[PDB]
């Protein structure tokens, strides 16, 4: 069988995960304590199954710092996790990627690779990882890295696929988040085979406009994240012959080095509190996808190019829809594809449309979309964060934090160069 | 096309830069220039997995038949990804040297390998390959059943009927569709005879499909 | 990171120290035989930071002057703290920094290093420590420098965070202050991560200027002090989303640059508007420092009470736009508001706030005339060579203070450009 592991790393990717698996189980008809009562068994590449009928997760939850994880072996999914899977330290990162990678990380490295370990002895056919992890905290930063680079050493041929948090300027986030992110992205780079960023000024302002929470919490933004994720793993979750599966899809998407930061737009995103919803169809969550404010990460596609573009349509979707959808598209907007590349759009659809979380935000859909886009308006989200970076950097602020947690200056130059690569390898593809 | 940028590409085959390896194979493909064939071929043999995914496809969309012995032996590499592109490339290619080696690639571990390589056999169209994809409509994967059952349809052969009028009983709504689309494409009288008995016989789908099929014949 | 570990050094140190904890014991609900006696189940959920389990104190009490002993435990909470954590001595150093840091100082550190051992083993994770001591004097001074190099040896990887007050002639006459409080600053300089700068300058001028009291006792700023460390440890005490390395590392942008300008408001209740632009008024700081005359490097805001937590995050970010010039621009989202629910006692609604400005510049310029004055007579200078210590000393404290002055300069004219 072709099985998945997650790994959450740090409060965002730990918090992310519950909103994940808490979708997973009412998506496969799991209750918390992993029983199944209710006939496709697709979903056991992402849990295990006891003799007795015990559906488990083959997710590990890792921080260095008990908090969070504390909340999930005391909360409503306790019974559902193995107690081996959740991984805590005493204490954190203190958003100082050098004690997530170094000094603090160092300590927890071994473990959490031993139950990885034992989670992959029980598979029969290891496809690969899904880390889920902040940019800005020091272990969503320092200690992803770190596993990523023992991960390759390990396993080397098998798929690594993540899920980050890309900082938003707000008055709690650290002052740090931009080098955090920037020293993380750098030694992750040869190590992941695609990275999912989400924006949380994005999905903040989605939850604002189409939720319409002016407040919104971690659990408003999570249950949403949760949503994009399960479509982009919904094909190995679930059988259908419309599916498109990891190798086709990564291949397609992320053909090439460095270059694999798709920007996901996810449609429709309805309250549930609106009294009428005229259901949508497979045209307008199309059109949707090409609107900049349903984007999970901020930036302007219509100003960058394309290189790839794949279209993971869930619900009552028939393929002359899409293809009808497709063609609209082709007409009316500014979808230019970069000289050198096949210009197609890859399209797989899931039948089962997405599940209601109960007391959630949003409103029941007969069709969904998450369309992913290997695009060079990317760079756009590159730019702001390494700028952001450069301020700072310019003065050297807050560097000492970092060298007197085992981590040398020259790291964050070195870092910098290869963003500054990065931004450039975006540049020249799209010229 | 420019011949200038062909040239160029070529030499950027053999750069350090594994991103320029892989853009450099890629943009080859979309050229599709004979010159391109031999330096893609040693791409093949690429460290870096990326790079020979991309000389695979780019072999495909030139489809030059020097490209064939090479991309088998690329249905033998430890990344599904390069035996994807080489399955893939093979069936562009149209050259019946690869039915056997791609009858091999309908039981790999990876389904996208398996999808790919049916719809690539049915692309080449040669008879060898009924057998194996007749029991390709029994694979876990409905995916991998609907490439089958479309394969079957694209070649031709009535060895495939009986075995396409038990895929119209099969769980998925859409390889139901394609074993019936399949069955039009066979035609004959053999057809007719199989819709006479399902149409007095059959229950839903099944029936519904063998009452349309006299409707026109 | 919960437990925190409390020491307070000399007159100013234990009597400073005394009304933090009578004012947090208060705010927690604990009476003077340490005893809870509260309602709010939010006053025992961070309660293990400053206290052990009926709640004792996690403080260390220290002096040369035996006398500090019996004036602590006759006070108002007196009765709490744990009779083993009193490290007393024989004979008052006398103003004298290398009594406390060299002789009569380094004899009694080693017993006092016992207590802070004890008190750090019943932690279930050690944050960090936090003095309260006067730069002015000797024992808090010299000791308490001493004492903070000494547990820097031990605790390499903990936090030390200082309350430490600044001398002034308007509070005290004693001509020495100065080469204590030079000879302390080049201590501070290289082993703490956090020092808010607690100016008797300024708590004279507050109570002169605002509050109207134009003759101050030391309980009249000690109110003032109990009330700003009251609300700058208000989010380790109170539920938030924190710790001491977190804060810090928010704060300190440099290594040297870790001194801190304090403040407090109010000084009938106030709107969240009326809040920020008076915590934001020179007026209000407990630092001597206009500033006007510098750059905030960054900034954390301490609210408390029942308000909107739109109208303070519209409030900080107005504050910031009609006054970009004081506020450094090549430091990303460098103001940090924070709201706590509980208020303090007596009030409905207040603000603390802790910045880290480019004037506090002034402070040490005040401080190092002062030195200069003296040290190039050599007045008094056999009071301290005579302890053991070298004049190079006093050479190396003063070229350390300027330069922090020049250090401080150069960010403040710093530019993104
Ligand atoms: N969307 C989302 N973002 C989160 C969540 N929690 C934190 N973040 C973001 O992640 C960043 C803070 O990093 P954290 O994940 O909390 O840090 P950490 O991995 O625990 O690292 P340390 O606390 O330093 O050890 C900020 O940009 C937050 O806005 C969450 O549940 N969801
Ligand atoms: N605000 C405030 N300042 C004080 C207090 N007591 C003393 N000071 C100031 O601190 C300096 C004197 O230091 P002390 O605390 O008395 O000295 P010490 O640390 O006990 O050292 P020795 O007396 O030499 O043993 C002067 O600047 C005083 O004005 C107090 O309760 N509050
Ligand atoms: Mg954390
Ligand atoms: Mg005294």
Redesign the pocket.
Known sequence: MRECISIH????????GN?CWELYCLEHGIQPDGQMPSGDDSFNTFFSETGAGKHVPRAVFV???PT?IDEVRTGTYRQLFHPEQLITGKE?????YA??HYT?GKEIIDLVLDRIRKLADQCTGLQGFLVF???????????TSLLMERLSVDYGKKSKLEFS?Y??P?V???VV?PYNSILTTHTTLEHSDCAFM?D?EA?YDICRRNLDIERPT??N??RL?SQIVSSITASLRFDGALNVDLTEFQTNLVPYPRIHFPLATYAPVISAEKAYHEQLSVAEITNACFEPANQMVKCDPRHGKYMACCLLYRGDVVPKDVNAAIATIKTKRSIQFVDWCPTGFKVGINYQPPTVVPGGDLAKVQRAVCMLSNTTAIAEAWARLDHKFDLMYAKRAFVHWYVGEGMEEGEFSEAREDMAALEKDYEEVGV | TDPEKVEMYIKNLQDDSTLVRSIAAAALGKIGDERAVEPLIKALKDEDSRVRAQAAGALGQIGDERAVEPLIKALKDEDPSVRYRAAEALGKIGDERAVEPLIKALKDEDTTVRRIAATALGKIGDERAVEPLIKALKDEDAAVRLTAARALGEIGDERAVEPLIKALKDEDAYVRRAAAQALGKIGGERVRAAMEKLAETGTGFARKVAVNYLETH | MREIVHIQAGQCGNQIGAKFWEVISDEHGIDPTGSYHGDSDLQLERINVYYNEKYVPRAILVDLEPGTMDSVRSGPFGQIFRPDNFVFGQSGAGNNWAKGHYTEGAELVDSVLDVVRKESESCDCLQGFQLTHSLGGGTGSGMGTLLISKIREEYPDRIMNTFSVMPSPKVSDTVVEPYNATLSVHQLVENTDETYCIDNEALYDICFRTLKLTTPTYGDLNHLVSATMSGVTTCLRFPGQADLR?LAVNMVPFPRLHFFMPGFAPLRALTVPELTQQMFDSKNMMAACDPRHGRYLTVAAIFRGRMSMKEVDEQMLNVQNKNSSYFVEWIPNNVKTAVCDIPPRGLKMSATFIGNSTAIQELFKRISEQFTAMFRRKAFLHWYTGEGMDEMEFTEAESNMNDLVSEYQQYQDATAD
């Open positions: 790393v740090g409060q965002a990717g730990v918090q992310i909103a921080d260095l710092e969070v954190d990162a203190a958003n100082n004690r997530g603090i992890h902040s940019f800005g905290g020091g272990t969503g930063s320092g200690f948090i900082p938003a707000q709690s986030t650290a988040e989400v949380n999905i971690y659990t933004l999570n994240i | 977190k």
